[PDB]
Amino acid sequence: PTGKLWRPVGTSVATIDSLAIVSDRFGQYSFVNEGMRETFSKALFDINMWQPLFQATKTGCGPIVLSSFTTTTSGYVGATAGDALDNPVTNGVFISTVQIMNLQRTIAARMRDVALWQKHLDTAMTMLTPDISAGSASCNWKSLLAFAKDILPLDNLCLTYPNEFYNVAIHRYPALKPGNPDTKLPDAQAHPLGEVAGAFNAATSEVGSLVGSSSTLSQAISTMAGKDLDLIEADTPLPVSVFTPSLAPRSYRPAFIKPEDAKWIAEFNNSSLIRKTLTYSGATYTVQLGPGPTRVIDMNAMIDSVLTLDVSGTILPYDTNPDLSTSVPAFVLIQTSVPIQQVTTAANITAITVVSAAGASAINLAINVRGQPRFNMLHLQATFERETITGIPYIYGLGTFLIPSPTSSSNFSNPTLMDGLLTVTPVLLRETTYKGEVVDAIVPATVMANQTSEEVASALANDAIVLVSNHLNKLANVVGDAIPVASRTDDSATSAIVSRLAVQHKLSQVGQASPTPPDYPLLWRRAKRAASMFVSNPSLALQVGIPVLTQSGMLSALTSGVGTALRTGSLGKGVTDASEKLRARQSLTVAKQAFFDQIGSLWP
Amino acid sequence: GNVQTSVNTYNITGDGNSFTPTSDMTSTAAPAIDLKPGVLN
Numbered sequence A: 001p002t003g004k005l006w007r008p009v010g011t012s013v014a015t016i017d018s019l020a021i022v023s024d025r026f027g028q029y030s031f032v033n034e035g036m037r038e039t040f041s042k043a044l045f046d047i048n049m050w051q052p053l054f055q056a057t058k059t060g061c062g063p064i065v066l067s068s069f070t071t072t073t074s075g076y077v078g079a080t081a082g083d084a085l086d087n088p089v090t091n092g093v094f095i096s097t098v099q100i101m102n103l104q105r106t107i108a109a110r111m112r113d114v115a116l117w118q119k120h121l122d123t124a125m126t127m128l129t130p131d132i133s134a135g136s137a138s139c140n141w142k143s144l145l146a147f148a149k150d151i152l153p154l155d156n157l158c159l160t161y162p163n164e165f166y167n168v169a170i171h172r173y174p175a176l177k178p179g180n181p182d183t184k185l186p187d188a189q190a191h192p193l194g195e196v197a198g199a200f201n202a203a204t205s206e207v208g209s210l211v212g213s214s215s216t217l218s219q220a221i222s223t224m225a226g227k228d229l230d231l232i233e234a235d236t237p238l239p240v241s242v243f244t245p246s247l248a249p250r251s252y253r254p255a256f257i258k259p260e261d262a263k264w265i266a267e268f269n270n271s272s273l274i275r276k277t278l279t280y281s282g283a284t285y286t287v288q289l290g291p292g293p294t295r296v297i298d299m300n301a302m303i304d305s306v307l308t309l310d311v312s313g314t315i316l317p318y319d320t321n322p323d324l325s326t327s328v329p330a331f332v333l334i335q336t337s338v339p340i341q342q343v344t345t346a347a348n349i350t351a352i353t354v355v356s357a358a359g360a361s362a363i364n365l366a367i368n369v370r371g372q373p374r375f376n377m378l379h380l381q382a383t384f385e386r387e388t389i390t391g392i393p394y395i396y397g398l399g400t401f402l403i404p405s406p407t408s409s410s411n412f413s414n415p416t417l418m419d420g421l422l423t424v425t426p427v428l429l430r431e432t433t434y435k436g437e438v439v440d441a442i443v444p445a446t447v448m449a450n451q452t453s454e455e456v457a458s459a460l461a462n463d464a465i466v467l468v469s470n471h472l473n474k475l476a477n478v479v480g481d482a483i484p485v486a487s488r489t490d491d492s493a494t495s496a497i498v499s500r501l502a503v504q505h506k507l508s509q510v511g512q513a514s515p516t517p518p519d520y521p522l523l524w525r526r527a528k529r530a531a532s533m534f535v536s537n538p539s540l541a542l543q544v545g546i547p548v549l550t551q552s553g554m555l556s557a558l559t560s561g562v563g564t565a566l567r568t569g570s571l572g573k574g575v576t577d578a579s580e581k582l583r584a585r586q587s588l589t590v591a592k593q594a595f596f597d598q599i600g601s602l603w604p
Numbered sequence B: 001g002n003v004q005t006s007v008n009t010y011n012i013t014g015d016g017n018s019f020t021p022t023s024d025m026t027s028t029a030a031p032a033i034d035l036k037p038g039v040l041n
């Protein structure tokens, strides 16, 4: 049973309506199921432990028995009259609301009390590493004590109550074994209150540490089910939400990104220059679109973000072409009639809006750093919005210069300030971008081995690629973490892949002389580096031309392997290299024993 | 370390005590008590 206890308000006959939460002057009795007593007992148990320090310091008020907050009522206990009717409990143990209040504020008040002392006990305890993980190692008690008698700073609490803290301590450190009163010798065994827990944390030499290897697994299992690593290369529309894209604002360096390497950025590849004009704040400036191609951020295929083009440390040659100086650098949109990459001359450019200029010309924004005047780090920045560009077939964001007077000097300059580190930040997660279009769902499998070397590094913050990369990255840490894809152990991961290579290379051999019986020693090893190359750089699985990894099978395969692989690790997964791991722990205890030996001499 | 006597069953400077870690019993109280909503009830 569970929930609050109910009782037949109509008396005797208890039906699915003659019940009612048995409330009263104390609040409502909620049932205390077996396991929920484990907690409140485990919590109180950790407080009772500090008994010797509560009396010493006259705080506290006696040991806290959980049997002081409960009661022994009886009735039907459920979550609702209907279902509570199927849990007739007699003399169960319930805790009334007003009690659920004290057991709370008591464990809270006492928790402070101890939390404090417990902190002093520690700066003194750990102040001599009472924990080794291979074999033993003593340190003659006299010295030890006479030593901490020093180190411990005058405001601890282990100097005001030595054997009032010691008695608390003995129950937390199975290192300190108190000398028995009637034989005046230790005990071999150490009996700290955490008897079992402390036994099951020792780094057992057979397998690393059960508490470790156990969690590193349940931890990975969490992720595997959580983010949705499963279904990682699913071939079908998936809401961007399914990718929980967060804290995702990637930055670049356009005016370098080739147009074909990333759809969201077209260029004005035209013969001559395209000097246009525009009255901005009265003054008339001339946008240039200089000698080179001047790659500009396209506006369509640009998920309403927060574009913030930073222009700093980048050269600013106002020294040579004086034409450049005087011009306030500024991010400006450019609506063109004919599609760009077909826009020849000025009459082609519909209009030009200065979405964000920089007050003060190019001769105050400068700063000489050895001849080559740089740009005082400043951030121009628009706030592009999907629909503010409705209809408008062609429009481009360009972080240019806005020259107040074009001249012969700036005839080979080309004032694109795009060489600066631009940082787009998708401000509306629901919508992603792929191959130049804005969508609401991705098709994972499509984005695999479909980008090129740099059609990946040139991805646009929160676009399929960047999403089908953030995803693999989780799955990449589950294998990297739990599975042993980094040793000659032909693990579950590199194993799922090997079975694909076989089934694959086996049918490609079917029909024709079949002169080559499948290899296997070579297949195991080829798939080992395939699974390994993945854990290594999760990204690669997106680039066209990557051995194994990019065939449709793998990944879809890998994950579902790694999947079941985590759901069976056992507990002693740590047996892997638990030999050198062990031998390394003995190595430490031998060096730490060496320490105790000095504590033992210096302070005799 | 001044002698106490009864407050607690053990004297610190008491006869034949012994600091001596054993890789076998890693000292530990109770920190990870579960209280999260679903798990506490």
Ligand SMILES: *C(=O)CCCCCCCCCCCCC
Binding pocket: A121, A124, A125, A145, A146, A148, A149, A152, A158, A159, A160, A161, A162, A163, A165, A166, A169, B001, B002, B012
């Ligand atoms: C008398 O108090 C002399 C000092 C000896 C003990 C003071 C505290 C240092 C040793 C701690 C023992 C309890 C757990 C560390």
